[PDB]
Symmetry: C6
Subunit: 298 residues, 6 copies
């Protein structure tokens, strides 16, 4: 999904170029992310986190991926959704400690979580293990033998107790850069009867740097779609790109991206080389988007 | 000592006729073939999904069939299993089935998944779990011991199979924690094809104060291929009814009345009447007035 | 002993036979169900009797048990009974099922605290006791089990987890005939924010045969009341029967039946003044609730 | 000792206007008579009683009278529905105790035997008010080797939840169980632990097994008679004019509030170095100690 | 070796220092100002009848409910009843909300409030004896009593009472904001009233009809019918300008504060417009300001400064909105 | 280091505040009131009582609490927490609160160290991400409390967003006020009447009457253009940032239109863009990093 994102694509003066390092348009957010990167580099981001507020499919995840790439090539990047913390399989503490340990790298670069799994056939099936892993890593670091980026999408799904965990996590030196994202304005803090901007408590909000993403133009949507086709090794007609950019603007960038793979399959079945308007057309009528599926049910 | 040996949704036999999706070489549906009648678009879409699964492109994704009740959502899921192969395990459950006094939601879900992973010695992982457990002797909790599953998984790994299809109807009944389980399940290589179904538009996600399309979180929705089913015509209803009569082993005028009863109520209620009308006929309209449908029973 | 007279249900009902009076259509429908159960076609379906209270829903269930055979166990419970301080819903339900195969009587007899020794103590049967009982029954069956009828009244009181239990129970071959009853149309499924016909989930509803009961006429009410007087060995004046049939039609068949015993207590043949005294002494739900709304 | 005077509920089960402590309330007393003969002739088996009436209409008095009529040794325990909800013990314990207080052993209640043969008896300490299962198992064994079931009165029954009602229902299946007499002043109400409404807040399962008896409020003449009986019981002498004032205060408020004033007015009269309680004593005490109507309004 | 001591109670906040009894004559009739009590004639008269009822052993099985608006001497009357019952009589005042603790159960919170109200004249409370004969105790306990410890304490106290070494003196337990208690807590109070060694229970509220917590039903004062039927309800009226001034003059003496007659006028106005508690809170602060000004008598400007500095509930909530 | 400059309440001998001293700027009445509280604590009159600072966000409620700690002494521990912090997946509300209190009680060995610091040192990288919980063993605290008793400077505990605490937490604070070695409790809110959490009753500031009747309520007014500028100039010096007089005017405007906290957040970012900060640097940074008002409005 973010194969193309190779950095934030900014010049020497931390100013974004229209298309560079995989990133297309979204000038202001990429400019703001640039200031955040230099803040992280100059050691000023300490104790603070990032909130990217924007409508779905506005490169919130892409900017988080770009920040990781810009911080370094070995920098661990883990993206989770707020809802993921609520599991039948594990506690919210476990869900969160795992997301954090997946975001702290150890250059022998391997994540703390990967080291936890290795020292522990099908998902149809310990504090001590982590205590031993943390001890060996402390020994190796002292002998002289990398905190990444943690992206939390749909952050308004987290409850007050989870927010306290994130807050206490920000107090650690070895903690990764916390980047949260939402599309919500005022909402209730889960586990609370109070409303708050983005559904985040005042204590955490006061420690955040809020960045906003604007929705893409017809020209920007087409460019992102052309980049995704290259990533999936799919060739399209210029007229098919126009149809897809329209389908994307009327529905979502995610639904337009979902169609690329299906349209390529239809084109390959037709014993074809380049995906034409009729392939995108067939696939659009076959596989519904949230707007059509919910309206057909009503 | 693991010991491999059972009829599934075959016990009710409601999909006896479904022998595949009945699509040609170009993945295009024929009006009536392999038990499937009409429902061209959904069967066409299911064809693209089958080729996606075959060419290894369905990886990380699942299917959502949105449609009014009695529109072949289960039939298309049964057809996809049959099309994937003859040995392919198929298990169809309802979202509400996860909520049990007998076992946890994790157990209910791990069992539904293990019933959908076949081992070609083809027998399900769950069948192997039940056979190698301390049971009529268990007739009148329902969880399989972790140790028993650990042994079964070990012997299967040593011997090494065929991941089938898992159909979850009334999916809007599942809560946020259950959806996280399905999401994590989709990350596994040996996972079956997940096919969910609903008749709901926007609804609250259970265990949440937020509304969402089909009551599914955005995280899972973004990983789904949404297919829709349209209700059947008079001609299509009659054909499905004629297929069911053959399966259960019948005047042309009686078929006209049943096709009307089916169009005015539901295809399921019309199908329910076939067996009862046959009993009355063997003893020597009556059956419709005797056995009520949801609409009449609630109104009376 | 409210159904003492019920001795059973050409599947065409006779106006009065085997204790059953009137209720022609429902008894006719029950006949088709009995032949379905006999010919092994009722597998893995259940019955829903939808009707207003006092319309013989329990009587038809009792009649179906009697018709299936004389030995056939019959247990009638209310949905609300599953909710106990003394035992879990699983236990409450496993007991109702084991009383319908009794297997439960065998469980009680071979259990530590029983009878007076169990009378108001510090309610569940140990799993080990049931494992031993199930083993001996399996041994006896092999050396050389009659599943009965389980009636669940006020079914809309059951929650989604209890419905899952009934659903899984229907998958068993040794399971009794499940007959549920309600007087409700659309209602919320307990433990859920969704409404549904009779408060039953679609999964179970799709497996039900719905039968409906109509209320009794003046002539039908009088006949049922005359049968009950005989069963309780009570004799009444023809004028007292007229008054009771009126009291029954204005209130309920159950309240009219409740009065029979009290009028007999209140001196050879029960006259109108005895039924009159007893009516003013013992109130029915309609009058007691209206008197409180003051 | 609010029911000191109640010594029973004629030969034809017909109530006399004033006898065995009972005054007026003819119909309900008549109905209680039929219930007693039903219990005696073994017809009350599986059934219980519901007394529906406004507060202070002798619902408890009729229950006390039924116990006295059943025999002099017959145990009688009166509890309120709300009493089952305790920090000290479970609802099961609260209910098993109320039932065991209502089953007598010929020589004393089963509960009294449970307390005597239990450790913690001494004498605002810890600690659960529950009796050990083993202690009850030993007591039940000795009693089985060697029983007078009394009356259990449950007031404010609409306070019980669905699980508690299932306990009462299962209790009615026992042969050694006491006569269950419930009471309420409510019409249709929600069954606690349920989203459904029902007559008296009782489930249909239990309601279908109940004999509903209703109590009407007392007249000026009946209120005065009950108040005269209570004054004698508490050994309090009043002026005929003070009885008129109290009967008025009782009719405007409640019979319980009027009866509460008898003791306080006697204290004021004794302080005034008096013999007979006069109108001014009942008047002082009425203005000092408030009733629900005045306390809620003045609050 | 069970070890008894006393300790300062509601005396630590000292708001009822002056309350030395109910100030009633031989005929149980209140004098306008006596034993610290000022005005509130009817409630004090009613409390007198309750005292004679407790003394003549007639209060048995019953409790008191004082219904009145905040700052109408509900706590003062409870304090006065304790003082009137005797000088050694333990008095503990709690709020309904205090039963809800992260540190202990509602049962513990309530058993402690009751054991703080039963004195042992070797006079020391049963709770104080529980603390002294418990593992940690004070600073060693700094950031529930064991059942065994209470079982031993109860045994020794029973033995000493029988021998004639000790005398158990049941005091007064005041429960303010009683409508905060739930149905289970009310059942505890009800069962407590059945004990012979139980203290006099005095509850208080400012509420009329309210829901019983843990219930969907409304009820007078948020108390169930079972307990209500066992209560003697007393009501308190709000104070006049003359009564407010007198209470304030008594508090100034108690805190050893001298005020100008004009400053008393301002404070009596501030008290009538806000609350008697807020006016009393200002006495200490105004004295501090006056002492800082190198002053002798607290004047209008001292009360004025302090009023604008320290807000009352009405102003603070309005400024926030 | 948001309160680096706060070195005391900046009051004269007569407990009267000087416009700008000991880091404190303006807020004369609240600083004056805090002075009376300090002398009340010193003269032993604050016994059993706590402080409530009611004011809109960014009105120096935390600064006045920091100033009170500094005024009480140089060794005096100061811990500031938010009500919401008590609700943790890592520890109980009791633990959260006992830790906040033990962080506020100093032990002067000559050096002062908190009771909590002594608890951590004498208890069994990267601990927040290790497992873990969070809580300190009762036995460890029992030993630490014993040795400290054998061999105490109570500080200040500031609880912001106090209306987030439930009735059980308020009972903890109430019982904590009964201890002699307890710190000065300073609570703060911006709310008028609100429900007490864990209750169906509304109350001023969401605090029960029992605790409210024991509080000394102090109010903070919002800052003027002249006061805002001065606080911002002090913060720039603390962060070693140089601004143009025109840039200070823009920042004072941005602060008055949004919040003092948002204006302070910009100082660091504007310095980074600059690397003397001019109006164009503050302008760029304002358009890049949004404040709560703009971010929520853009999302709607
Ligand atoms: N500015 C951008 N440049 C390049 N790719 C982008 C850009 N914005 C979005 N994309 C791509 O579009 C898809 C959806 O974007 P995403 O980052 O997930 O947005 P959001 O988190 O706001 O929903 C991804 O494949 C992502 O890499
Ligand atoms: N297109 C179809 N061709 C043949 N049988 C069908 C078709 N659609 C539905 N059926 C049959 O009708 C019955 C009810 O259909 P079902 O698939 O369960 O509906 P739903 O969409 O609600 O799951 C089943 O016996 C099913 O096999
Ligand atoms: N068809 C009938 N024939 C004889 N008795 C009947 C008939 N219908 C009802 N009764 C009797 O009337 C009483 C109440 O009927 P019941 O079966 O409990 O109905 P329901 O379950 O609908 O409330 C019982 O004593 C029952 O035996
Ligand atoms: N019929 C009666 N005869 C004598 N005393 C009665 C009678 N009815 C009520 N009382 C007395 O009046 C008082 C209150 O009556 P009670 O039985 O408690 O009624 P309820 O339970 O309906 O509130 C008691 O002292 C009771 O003994
Ligand atoms: N009648 C009175 N005489 C003397 N002091 C009183 C009187 N009424 C109230 N007080 C005092 O006023 C203050 C607040 O009164 P309080 O008893 O707490 O009232 P309440 O419990 O109704 O809120 C206390 O310091 C109390 O001693
Ligand atoms: N009067 C003041 N003097 C100096 N700095 C102040 C003053 N008021 C606020 N500040 C500073 O402004 C910032 C925000 O103020 P803060 O104390 O956190 O207010 P609040 O708690 O009301 O939100 C902090 O950096 C704080 O030190």
């Amino acid at each position: 999904a973010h194969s193309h994102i190779r950095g934030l694509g900014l010049d020497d003066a931390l100013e974004p170029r229209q298309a560079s390092q995989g990133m297309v348009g979204q000038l202001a957010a990429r400019r703001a992310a640039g200031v955040v990167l230099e803040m992280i580099r100059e050691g000023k981001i300490a104790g603070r986190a990032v909130l990217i507020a924007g409508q779905p499919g506005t490169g919130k995840t892409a900017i988080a991926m770009g920040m990781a790439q810009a911080l370094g090539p070995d920098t661990p990047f883990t993206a989770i959704a707020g809802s993921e913390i609520f599991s039948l399989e594990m506690s919210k503490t476990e869900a969160l400690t795992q997301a954090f340990r997946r975001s702290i790298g150890v250059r022998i670069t391997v994540s703390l979580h990967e080291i936890d799994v290795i020292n522990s056939f099908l998902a149809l099936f310990k504090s001590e293990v982590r205590e031993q892993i943390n001890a060996k890593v402390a020994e190796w670091r002292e002998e002289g033998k990398i905190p990444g980026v943690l992206f939390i999408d749909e952050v308004h799904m987290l409850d007050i107790e989870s927010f306290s965990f994130l807050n206490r996590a920000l107090e650690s030196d070895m903690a990764p850069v916390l980047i949260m994202a939402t599309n919500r304005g005022i909402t209730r803090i889960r586990g609370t009867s109070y409303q708050s901007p983005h559904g985040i408590p005042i204590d955490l909000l006061d420690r955040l740097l809020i960045v906003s993403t604007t929705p893409y133009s017809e020209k920007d949507t087409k460019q992102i779609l052309r980049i995704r086709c290259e990533e999936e090794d799919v060739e399209m007609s210029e007229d098919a790109y126009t149809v897809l950019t329209r389908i994307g603007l009327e529905t979502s960038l995610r639904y337009a991206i979902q169609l690329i793979t299906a349209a390529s399959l239809v084109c390959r079945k037709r014993k074809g080389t380049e995906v034409q308007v009729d392939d995108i057309k067939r696939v659009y009528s076959l596989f519904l988007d949230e707007s059509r599926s919910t309206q057909y049910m009503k």
